Write a protein that binds this ligand. Structure first.
Ligand SMILES: Cc1cc2nc3c(=O)[nH]c(=O)nc-3n(C[C@H](O)[C@H](O)[C@H](O)COP(=O)(O)OP(=O)(O)OC[C@H]3O[C@@H](n4cnc5c(N)ncnc54)[C@H](O)[C@@H]3O)c2cc1C
Ligand code: FES
Lengths: 98, 303
């Protein structure tokens, strides 16, 4: 499928609605969609691209940089998250950890 | 954190950046011999001074020293435990790491750059104080069933987690240190690497070979000195492709589990292989694989 991923931002007040195929990390999609996203290793191997889910679902089977307690809240890594659903999510959520 | 331990039996995150555990280094020996490509070195920390717990398949965080290079405090860099839970000395006080030196020419100025952390570890000094972060892993847990079949597709320093898998399985010591797990099943490791002398842990994984013909099979992929009949250097994807039918046969078993680890981009070639060999029996490997993650039988960690 190809689900809508509305990028919301707690600051400038962004609710940017984007479309993401079933086979593309949430990062690359919106990123090349006219939206410059925060990131670093782009390999599920750091926190730069951290995200805090609001409503929706993704797939986290390619990670292992990955606290069961952290992920239990709804935290995502945009550079490696496949929309398992229509996903609302807030970016720039890397300071919520540590 | 620190005292954060009250639930489950899997040691996960009994230590946090907000409560580092300054483990200390015991040894630090090469793993790529002369002729090899790059620097990859075995690093072993002592655990005394803390209550650090873990098992085989978990990840351990290392915190670098430094407060001046990008203004802010250094950040975590995660690594996979290269050792059983008991540690590398078959006790409970140690733990081993598999770290490659990261270097690349600058995107712009071409200057070779050295990753802060691994460049730290690789040149690390015995008894050099190192801050460790508790374990953070649950997607590469090793099942307690000796009967289970452990398929292991790793490249480069992705040989970490299979070492803990294979060590516990086939290490005499641990074999006696874990009487309640005498592996009688059949595990299979496909190992991709540029050079023979790049073959990390070769002279032990092969010792495990001649001793357990029936429980361990061992396939190298050496691109720089191995060619498929179609005239193309040997990558693990190429080795999988060669044994696709075989391998596909395995995972269709009931308790057969798969473990892939190593640098990102290894998984695409391998999904293509199983796909073709599985489609012949009529099935979408994407769908079949789609459902094996739910059943907890397909385990991927690629960084
Ligand atoms: C679960 C997990 C397990 C891991 N296990 C291991 C392991 O066992 N052994 C191991 O060696 N590593 C492993 N890694 C990777 C390791 O955690 C670090 O990501 C890696 O060692 C980088 O080291 P560093 O901190 O020295 O680099 P850093 O200082 O963080 O710098 C790396 C940074 O360089 C930049 N960059 C990198 N390459 C390029 C390039 N060519 N051009 C432009 N920009 C670039 C990026 O900003 C990148 O994040 C694992 C990763 C994870 C997530
Ligand atoms: S940019 Fe490092 S995990 Fe996404």
């Amino acid at each position: 499928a190809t689900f809508k991923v509305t990028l919301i931002n707690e600051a400038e007040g962004t609710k940017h609605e984007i479309e993401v195929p079933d086979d593309e990390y949430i990062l690359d999609a919106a990123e090349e969609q006219g939206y410059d996203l925060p990131f670093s290793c782009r390999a599920g191997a750091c926190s730069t691209c951290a995200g805090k889910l609001v409503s929706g679902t993704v797939d986290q089977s390619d990670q292992s940089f990955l606290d069961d307690d952290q992920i239990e809240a709804g935290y995502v890594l945009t550079c490696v998250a496949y929309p398992t659903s229509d996903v609302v999510i807030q970016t720039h959520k890397e300071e919520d950890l540590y | 954190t620190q005292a954060k331990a009250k639930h489950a039996d899997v040691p996960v995150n009994l230590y946090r950046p907000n409560a580092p555990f300054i483990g200390k280094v015991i040894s630090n020996e090469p793993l790529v011999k002369e002729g090899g490509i790059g620097i990859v070195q075995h690093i072993k920390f002592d655990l005394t001074g803390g209550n650090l717990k873990y098992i085989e398949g978990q990840s351990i965080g290392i915190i670098p020293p430094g407060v001046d290079k990008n203004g802010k405090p250094e950040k975590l860099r995660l690594y996979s435990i290269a050792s059983t839970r008991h540690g590398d000395d078959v006790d409970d006080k140690t733990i081993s790491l598999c770290v490659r030196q990261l270097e690349y020419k600058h995107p712009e100025s071409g200057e070779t750059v050295y990753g802060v952390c691994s460049t730290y570890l690789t040149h690390i000094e015995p008894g050099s104080e190192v801050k460790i972060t508790g374990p953070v892993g649950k997607e590469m847990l090793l099942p307690d069933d000796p009967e289970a079949n452990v398929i292991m597709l790793a490249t480069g320093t992705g040989i970490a987690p299979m070492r803990t898998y294979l060590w516990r399985m086939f290490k005499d010591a641990e074999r006696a240190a874990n009487p309640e797990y005498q592996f009688k099943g059949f595990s299979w490791l496909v190992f991709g690497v540029p050079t023979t002398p790049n073959i990390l842990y070769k002279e032990e994984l092969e010792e495990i070979q001649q001793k357990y013909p029936d429980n361990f099979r061992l396939t190298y992929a050496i691109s720089r000195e191995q060619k498929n009949p179609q005239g193309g250097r040997m990558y693990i994807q190429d080795r999988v492709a060669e044994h696709a039918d075989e391998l596909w046969q395995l995972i269709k078993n009931q308790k057969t589990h798969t473990y892939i680890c190593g640098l990102r981009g290894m998984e695409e070639g391998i999904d293509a292989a199983l796909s073709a060999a599985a489609a012949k029996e009529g099935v979408t490997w994407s769908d079949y694989q789609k459902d094996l993650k739910k059943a907890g039988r397909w385990h991927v960690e690629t960084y």
